[PDB]
RNA sequence: GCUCGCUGGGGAUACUGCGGGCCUUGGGACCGGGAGAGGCCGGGGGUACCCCCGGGGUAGGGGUGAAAUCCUAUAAUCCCGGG
């Protein structure tokens, strides 16, 4: 019939990870990060690295019979930043251009109800 | 005039003091329907986070103005089921 999967996208200020699994989440189809396609640490979070990694992952998934995906995009969350980096939308767009159908899109950043304390002291980074 | 201080008598009763009597405006007591993260004791939860075990996957993850120490083939980062 139709084999649908899930694309988990992890976006921070330092890197991007694109991880395609099956509908239940328990079996991995492909997994590509920014440091696997570019050679400079400075370029790992850039949008272009996101496009390259997304294209590699989409090809590997298409060869194995996946037809479309649902998307789950997240920032680090927790006691770290709640805002996704610059490579989220670029990764989302490059999946559709590569041949997959796109289902529903949502963000699953984990948000505390007044949880743990953040690193940096009571004055924070002083640069 | 000064030593502004003392002492014997007579008079007055507004104010202050002392004795009695009568009040309710200040203050306190009590009754009614409501408001509030006021305090203490007992019970039940919420996400997040860290560690441990099992399944997948395979070469990087993390971090900076730029880097390196550090973590990772005893299988990490990432995803799933439990404690
Ligand atoms: Mg890297
Ligand atoms: Mg300075
Ligand atoms: Mg394991």
CA of A48 to the centre of ligand 1 (A): 15
Q: What resolution in angstroms does the PDB record give?
A: 2.7
> Which residues interact with strand B by a CB < 7 Å criterion?
A 8, 10, 12-15, 17, 19, 21, 24-28, 31, 33-36, 40-42, 44, 74, 77-80, 110-116, 127
**Which residues pair with residue A101 across a beta bridge?**
A68
Place of tokens 């330092």: A14
Handedness of CA A45, A49, A55, A57 (dihedral sign): negative
Question: Solved by what technique?
Answer: cryo-EM
Q: Rounded to the nearest 5 degrees, what angle is found at the Cα of A80, between the Cα atoms of A41 and A19?
A: 60
Q: Which nucleotide is nearest to A37 (CA to C1')?
A: B60
User: Which nucleotides of strand B lie under 7 Å from a protein CB?
Assistant: 46-50, 55-68, 77-81
Q: How far is CA A26 from CA A29, A30, A77, A119, in A?
A: 10, 12, 22, 33
Domain spans of chain A? 2-119
- The DSSP result for A107-127, as a single string, is E-----SS-PPPSSTTT----
Q: Which ligand is nearest to the CA of A127?
A: 2
Kindly give, in sequence order, each residue whose CB lies less than 8 Å from that of residue A57, ignoring residues fewer than 6 positions away. A7, A18, A19, A20, A30, A31, A32, A95
- Pick from A5, A7, A9: which is nearest to A89 by CA? A9
Q: State how far the Cα of A90 lies from the Cα of A108, in Å rounded to an integer.
A: 18
Letter string b/e over residues A88-110, b meaning 16 or more CB atoms within 10 A of that residue's CB = bebbbebbeebebeeeeeeeebe
CA–chain centroid gap for A71, Å, is 9
Strands (E), A1-127: 4-11, 16-22, 28-33, 68-74, 101-107
- Pick from A34, A12, A27: which is nearest to A94 by CA? A34
CATH of domain A2-119: 3.30.420.80
For chain A, the residue count is: 127
Relative to beta strand A101-107, strand A4-11 is unpaired
């Amino acid at each position: 019939k139709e084999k649908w999967g899930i694309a988990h996208i992890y976006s921070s200020y330092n890197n991007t990870i694109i991880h395609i699994t099956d509908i239940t989440g328990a079996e991995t189809i492909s997994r590509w990060s920014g440091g696997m396609v570019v050679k400079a640490d400075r370029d790992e979070p850039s949008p272009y690295a996101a496009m390259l990694a997304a294209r590699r992952a989409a090809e590997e998934a298409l060869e194995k019979g996946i037809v479309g995906v649902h998307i789950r995009v997240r920032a680090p969350g927790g006691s770290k930043s709640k805002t996704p980096g610059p490579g989220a939308q670029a990764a989302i767009r490059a999946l559709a251009r590569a041949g997959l159908k796109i289902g529903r899109v949502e963000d699953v950043t984990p948000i505390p109800h007044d949880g743990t304390r953040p690193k940096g002291g009571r004055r924070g980074r002083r640069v």
